[PDB]
Write an enzyme that holds these catalytic residues in place. Structure first.
Site, PDB file in Angstrom:
ATOM      1  N   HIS A 275      -9.449 -19.662  26.472  1.00 35.78           N
ATOM      2  CA  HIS A 275      -9.811 -18.942  27.691  1.00 35.78           C
ATOM      3  C   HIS A 275     -10.835 -19.733  28.499  1.00 35.78           C
ATOM      4  O   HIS A 275     -10.911 -19.599  29.719  1.00 35.78           O
ATOM      5  CB  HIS A 275     -10.368 -17.559  27.336  1.00 35.78           C
ATOM      6  CG  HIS A 275      -9.501 -16.774  26.398  1.00 35.78           C
ATOM      7  ND1 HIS A 275      -9.583 -16.900  25.028  1.00 35.78           N
ATOM      8  CD2 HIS A 275      -8.541 -15.848  26.633  1.00 35.78           C
ATOM      9  CE1 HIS A 275      -8.703 -16.094  24.459  1.00 35.78           C
ATOM     10  NE2 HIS A 275      -8.060 -15.441  25.411  1.00 35.78           N
ATOM     11  N   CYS A 609      -5.886 -12.479   4.520  1.00 37.65           N
ATOM     12  CA  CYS A 609      -6.031 -11.717   5.730  1.00 37.65           C
ATOM     13  C   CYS A 609      -4.736 -11.008   6.073  1.00 37.65           C
ATOM     14  O   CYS A 609      -3.640 -11.490   5.779  1.00 37.65           O
ATOM     15  CB  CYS A 609      -6.522 -12.593   6.877  1.00 37.65           C
ATOM     16  SG  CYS A 609      -5.278 -13.632   7.567  1.00 37.65           S
TER      17      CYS A 609
END
Ligand SMILES: *[C@@H]1O[C@H](CO)[C@@H](O[C@@H]2O[C@H](CO)[C@@H](O)[C@H](O)[C@H]2NC(C)=O)[C@H](O)[C@H]1NC(C)=O
Ligand SMILES: *[C@H]1O[C@H](CO)[C@@H](O)[C@H](O)[C@H]1NC(C)=O
Ligand SMILES: *[C@H]1O[C@H](CO)[C@@H](O)[C@H](O)[C@H]1NC(C)=O
Ligand SMILES: [Ca+2]
Ligand SMILES: [Cu+2]
Ligand SMILES: [Cu+2]
Lengths: 630, 631
Positions: A275, A609
């Site tokens: 970003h 995860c």
């Protein structure tokens, strides 16, 4: 009271020389006449509309656009003769006309706050809510239709006629001009940024210094596109649950507050690799004011930054071209259990930086476990013993000044800047105060870390990581200090991107046999060094020893593995994070979070995860449990 | 007070994914699902009851209190072997082993049975809600076996919160929501690509812009077109929502419920309008949906909404309940097609209270049934059932089950709250046994069948139906109860002398007296009667009637209506062409189910008599409620 907001929606041309949209106007019309509150922080924003618990708001939108555009709320109640949302809610003739304002139309809007949608006994004085527009949800938005809509307890018109409050609305938003109202040839559509203030653009205003400033923060987009926002000072409102860095997702709004130090217009990140380049920014001029016309500890750390070698997968190895794991490390010839040259923090005994500090072969790459309660002072004396120079800064504390003076190394703007060459040592002082530690709500020990900051990850990625722990006050007094406080233990979820490491092609003359074909920059080879691991250990490489009925805190974080988030695993086990009980922890890239766990489920458990696209790219360890003794 | 060991006999099977609604080339899909069975003999499919059909394309509810016992006796029926797994799966001890094979693997047709104390580990707290929410799924391949279709809900409750009636309900009514974006590069999908969609017209799109679930699948279960079924709830009985997002790493979903707000607990309880569900974060949140009518849930995330989240939910008032019209209905509406015969026939005449000798339904038929076309999807809260009387014979139906269709095509049985397999209803006991049965959870249908389960001399019935529209508020506006004051109505003029005052303030659906209705001073078609609502109302229709003047009959045969917002100038009622010639009365008594095509939103309602009998005479009533107030 009974409130009216006579403001329609328009087509406007936008900027900071690229891109022009459809906005949400502001004006006192019966026809089409100017009317502006917008100067500062108001970007592309239908006016911040505010109603109190018992009130009744009447927006009447005059539409002017090639667009068929609606008006639709959230957080508020109304009749099926508003809603402003097309789809068959059965709705008789006149009950659907709110759902789509035909292009260049006109419609009134019936909006109510009941008791049942005012804000709860104890939370934000005033709730974060926005007002959307949805006919074609994707189009109506990216185009540029969005405003702020606030709602709160019995007393704005009366207790803000008499009260002082410093509040803004920051619209953390990602319009994509390819999903606009709008549609050899080489330059296709783009944007990505705050308030509508692009690239590096800056908006407007600031709040006074010696007190607090509240912001209703509205998350935006037309896609699952997560951010992670910062500036200096902690950002402690979430509830009075007290947070490291506002973390924004798809469509999100709760409302938060911070304190201040001085004029330093503070830096405003989106702080993620992807970003970044096309990212979000804004300042904050923190100025002087209008409205005047069993004690504390002292910790010590001798740490060196130091070059070593790293075998990510020692214990276990079984490669060839036999797997996706078989492919990992040095995509030429060499490819077994994977060995690279890294530079990890490592602490020594004393100023004579000689005596090797006995290591913690569970923390693998991780730096020495740093700890300091509120009120304490960390004297952190730091040697470089690696050629290519680095430093040390704790993401956590704010009072970090060189030991003896309040100087700045002869030249630089602040310590996480340039200092410390090969050889030379620097005495740093970290003083910890109530503001950067937990509270009467949090855990008692918030999770944080230290990187080095000469380069960002062109540093970190090469090994510069270590866990910093800030904590509540206690010593043979306070809470839970009568027989023992059972030890501290850290997991670090980290993708190390060797492809950036300050030991880049150093490592290719090394482990990789022949550069007789000195190949670089590649599809699979670049992927061949993206090392998804927990504490450098990977692919069920060194797990962790524990036992049942044992009980203590885990401190965990996501670092280096960015662009994305991590829902995190633990097989069959469950934790008490935020004094609720959840089974999976969602973790950003700032992500400092602190769980607690009753270890009493005997067996192998595949910690990894909750995302099953890294836990195959490595990214898993094991845990073992069985009775003990004492 | 006790502890309970609550087993759940459960398995894993397949069928899959239907679309057919309105919005035919539809594809077959063959993913796997969990399924609740009846016992160890894995036979009874355990019909999914009206109360939990929202659950739909995932597994059944597994439920426990704090100091409890959970048990699962599990059979796999499939290809790739799968398994049960959640968090508290508290395995035990140790063994003479080789580094601890703690591997849970359930091979097809084999039975892996597991059961464990559910410690305060899994329990919600004093700070929290009456129940927390947890996931179970197949851990054989947690990655694939989630797009495959083994999502499952698990509820863990405070002590003394459940019931004998199974589950809980102490002002509860729970629903789970299961937001994933399913994809088939996962689970045996090969047996789909060239199983269906391909024969000698094949070899079209290998993996290029084909994306068959990013062609579709944006689950809120897997009934997730832009519409899944069972979201029935009472506009008060405050509803708890169980939101659990799953899937991959883009599977953030930010859901809300339009024009509604809910409260979440944590540290405390703080009020919120929409919730970024995360993958692995199993939300419980409660709300009090005090806005009646018909709404929806949508993942507000632009691109997600626009390919399948706009998935309706309905809230009814239960203060709405009028006879659906069996006196005031439909002269000879609907009946059967062979089930039903005995000279003195079926319906035609099988209504409640119908006097005479030739009166009601009548069939000596071991296999029977009757059918009512409600001519529109309707809410049916109950059914008053009664029996007839013969030569000297008491004959009635003693037992019955109730099936319904919303469509006409595919039917099914009924399962009033948590009963068993099938909802058995108790009939009458005589020739006047009005045994008003109520539907515990309601029913939305167009068609109802009644089937006898035991009779007297003949399967013999006369009946009425309870309910009303989704909420076109088929409830009397206040003419009868006189919630509308005598002051609140004027007319064009009123007849008045000494022995009478037929003032407008009398026009009331049943009103006795000497002057017991409204009458105009003289007889004109341009004559009218005006209700004034002191607020802005929504109207279904006006119920008309005449007067019994002890003199002669008096009633109005045809009329018009006019509407206003101002109350001084009038936009009147229309068809699809000219004005509406209204089908009115024919007697001193008997009222008229006379309703409106476009539900009229107004505040000033005027009756316009056109044709009448002897004089213009009106006792009346309005049906309805209200939208917003004036503006
Ligand atoms: C601000 O936006 C501009 C938009 O062009 C960026 O300019 C270029 O971005 C491309 C991405 O393809 C890069 O290759 C170049 O680095 C840029 N080239 C030019 C001509 O400057 C620019 O990067 C953005 N500014 C910031 C914050 O770095
Ligand atoms: C038992 O179940 C599995 C389902 O695929 C299969 O292997 C086998 O055919 C079944 N047994 C029967 C019905 O004989
Ligand atoms: C059946 O369940 C509904 C669900 O709320 C409840 O209202 C009703 O009381 C129950 N039926 C009984 C036991 O009468
Ligand atoms: Ca509507
Ligand atoms: Cu960002
Ligand atoms: Cu979504």
């Amino acid at each position: 009271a009974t409130r009216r907001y006579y403001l329609g929606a328009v087509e406007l041309s936008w900027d900071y020389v690229v891109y022009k949209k459809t906005l949400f106007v502001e004006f006192t019309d019966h026809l089409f006449n100017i009317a502006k509150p917008r100067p500062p922080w108001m970007g592309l924003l239908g006016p911040t509309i505010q109603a109190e618990v018992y009130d009744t708001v009447v927006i009447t939108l005059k539409n002017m656009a090639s667009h068929p555009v609606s008006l639709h709320a959230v957080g508020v109640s109304y009749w099926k003769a508003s809603e402003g949302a097309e789809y068959d809610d059965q709705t008789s003739q006149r009950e659907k006309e709110d759902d789509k304002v035909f292009p260049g139309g006109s419609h009134t809007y019936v909006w109510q706050v009941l008791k049942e949608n005012g804000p709860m006994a104890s939370d934000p004085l005033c709730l974060t809510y926005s007002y959307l527009s949805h006919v074609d949800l994707v189009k109506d938005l990216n185009s540029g239709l969005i405003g702020a809509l606030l709602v709160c307890r019995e007393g704005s018109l009366a207790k803000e006629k008499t009260q002082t409050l410093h509040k803004f609305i920051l619209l953390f938003a990602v319009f994509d001009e390819g999903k606009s109202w709008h549609s050899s040839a080489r330059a296709w559509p783009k944007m990505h940024t705050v308030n509508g203030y692009v690239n590096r653009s800056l908006p407007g205003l600031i709040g006074c210094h010696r007190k607090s400033v509240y912001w209703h923060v509205i998350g935006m987009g037309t896609t699952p596109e997560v951010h992670s926002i910062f500036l200096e000072g902690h950002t402690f409102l979430v509830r009075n649950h007290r947070q490291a860095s506002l973390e924004i997702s798809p469509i999100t709004f709760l409302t938060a507050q911070t304190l201040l130090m001085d004029l330093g217009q503070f830096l405003l990140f989106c702080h993620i690799s992807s970003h970044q380049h096309d990212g979000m920014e804004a300042y904050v001029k923190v100025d002087s004011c209008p409205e005047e016309p069993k004690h504390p500890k002292t910790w010590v750390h001798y740490i060196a930054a130091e070059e070593e070698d790293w075998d990510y997968a020692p214990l276990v190895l079984a490669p060839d071209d036999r797997s996706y794991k078989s492919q990992y490390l040095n995509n030429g010839p060499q490819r077994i259990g994977r060995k690279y040259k890294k530079v990890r923090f490592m602490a020594y005994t004393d100023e004579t930086f000689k005596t090797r500090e006995a290591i913690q072969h569970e923390s693998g790459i991780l730096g020495p476990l740093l700890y300091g309660e509120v009120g304490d002072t960390l004297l952190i004396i730091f040697k470089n013993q690696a050629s290519r120079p680095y430093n040390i800064y704790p993401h956590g504390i704010t009072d970090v000044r060189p030991l003896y003076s309040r100087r700045l190394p002869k030249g630089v703007k602040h310590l996480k800047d340039f200092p410390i060459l090969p050889g030379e040592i620097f005495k740093y002082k970290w003083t910890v105060t109530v503001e950067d530690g937990p509270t009467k709500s949090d855990p008692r020990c918030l999770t944080r870390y230290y990187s080095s900051f000469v380069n960002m990850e062109r540093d970190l990625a090469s090994g510069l990581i270590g866990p910093l722990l800030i904590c509540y006050k206690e010593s043979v007094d306070q809470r839970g200090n009568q027989i023992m406080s059972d030890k501290r233990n850290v997991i670090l979820f980290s993708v190390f991107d060797e492809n950036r490491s300050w030991y880049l092609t150093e490592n290719i003359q090394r482990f990789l046999p022949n550069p007789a074909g000195v190949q670089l920059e590649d599809p699979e080879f670049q992927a061949s060094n993206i090392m998804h691991s927990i504490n450098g250990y990977v692919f069920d490489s060194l797990q962790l020893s524990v036992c049942l009925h044992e009980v203590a805190y885990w401190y965990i974080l996501s670092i280096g593995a960015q662009t994305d988030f991590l829902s995190v695993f633990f097989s069959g086990y469950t934790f008490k994070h935020k004094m609720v009980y959840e089974d999976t922890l969602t973790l950003f890239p700032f992500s400092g979070e602190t769980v607690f766990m009753s270890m009493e489920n005997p067996g192998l458990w595949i910690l990894g995860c909750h995302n099953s696209d890294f836990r195959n790219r490595g990214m898993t360890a094991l845990l073992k449990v069985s009775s003990c003794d004492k | 007070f006790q502890k309970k060991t609550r087993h759940y006999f459960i398995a894993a099977v397949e069928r899959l994914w239907d679309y057919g609604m309105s919005s035919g080339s539809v594809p077959q899909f063959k993913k796997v699902v969990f399924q609740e069975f009846t016992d160890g003999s894995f036979t009874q499919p355990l019909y999914r009851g009206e109360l939990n059909e929202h659950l739909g394309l995932l597994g059944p509810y597994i439920r426990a209190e704090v100091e409890d016992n959970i048990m699962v006796t599990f059979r796999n029926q499939a290809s790739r072997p799968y398994s049960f797994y959640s968090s508290l799966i508290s395995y035990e001890e140790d063994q003479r082993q080789g580094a601890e094979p703690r591997k849970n693997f359930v091979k097809p047709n084999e039975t892996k049975t597991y059961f464990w104390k559910v410690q305060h580990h899994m329990a919600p707290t004093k700070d929290e809600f009456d129940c927390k929410a947890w996931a179970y799924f197949s851990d054989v391949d947690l990655e694939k076996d989630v797009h495959s279709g083994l999502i499952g809900p698990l509820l863990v409750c405070h002590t003394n919160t459940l019931n004998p009636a199974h589950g809980r309900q102490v002002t509860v009514q729970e629903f789970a929501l299961f937001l994933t974006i399913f994809d088939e590069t996962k689970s045996w999908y090969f047996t789909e690509n060239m199983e269906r969609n391909c024969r000698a017209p094949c070899n079209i799109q290998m993996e290029d812009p084909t994306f068959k679930e990013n062609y579709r699948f944006h689950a809120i279960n897997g009934y997730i077109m832009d519409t899944l079924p069972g979201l029935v709830m009472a506009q008060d009985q405050r509803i708890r929502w169980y939101l659990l997002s799953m899937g991959s790493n883009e599977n953030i979903h930010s859901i809300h419920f339009s024009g509604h707000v809910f409260t979440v607990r944590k540290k405390e309880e703080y009020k919120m309008a929409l919730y970024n569900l995360y993958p692995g974060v199993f939300e419980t949140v409660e709300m009090l949906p005090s806005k009646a009518g018909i709404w929806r849930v949508e993942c507000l995330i632009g691109e997600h909404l626009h390919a399948g989240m706009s998935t309706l939910f309905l809230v009814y008032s239960n203060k709405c309940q009028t006879p659906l019209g069996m006196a005031s209905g439909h002269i000879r509406d609907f009946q059967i097609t062979a089930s039903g015969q005995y000279g003195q026939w079926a319906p035609k005449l099988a209504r409640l209270h119908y006097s005479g000798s030739i009166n009601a339904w009548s069939t000596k038929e071991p296999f029977s049934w009757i059918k009512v076309d409600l001519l529109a999807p309707m809410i049916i809260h109950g059914i008053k059932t009664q029996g007839a009387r013969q030569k000297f014979s008491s004959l009635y139906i003693s037992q019955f089950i109730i099936m319904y269709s919303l469509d006409g095509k595919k039917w099914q049985t009924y399962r009033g709250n948590s009963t068993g397999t099938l909802m058995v209803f108790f009939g009458n006991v005589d020739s006047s046994g009005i045994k008003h049965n109520i539907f515990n959870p309601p029913i939305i249908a167009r068609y109802i069948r009644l089937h006898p389960t035991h009779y007297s001399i003949r399967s013999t019935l006369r009946m009425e139906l309870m309910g009303c529209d989704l909420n076109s508020c088929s409830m009397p506006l206040g003419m009868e109860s006189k919630a509308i004051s005598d002051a609140q109505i004027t007319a064009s003029s009123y007849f008045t002398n000494m022995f009478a005052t037929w003032s407008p303030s009398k026009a009331r659906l049943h009103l006795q007296g000497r002057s017991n209705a409204w009458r105009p001073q003289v007889n004109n078609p341009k004559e009218w009667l005006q209700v004034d609502f002191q607020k802005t109302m929504k109207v279904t229709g006006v119920t008309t009637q005449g007067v019994k003047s002890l003199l002669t009959s008096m009633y109005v045969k045809e009329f018009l209506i006019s509407s206003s917002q101002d109350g001084h100038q009038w936009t009147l009622f229309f068809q699809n062409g000219k004005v509406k010639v209204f089908q009115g009365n024919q007697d001193s008594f008997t009222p008229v189910v006379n309703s409106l095509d476009p539900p009229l939103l107004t505040r000033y309602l005027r009756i316009h008599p056109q044709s009448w009998v002897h004089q213009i005479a009106l006792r009346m009533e309005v049906l309805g409620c209200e939208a917003q107030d004036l503006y």
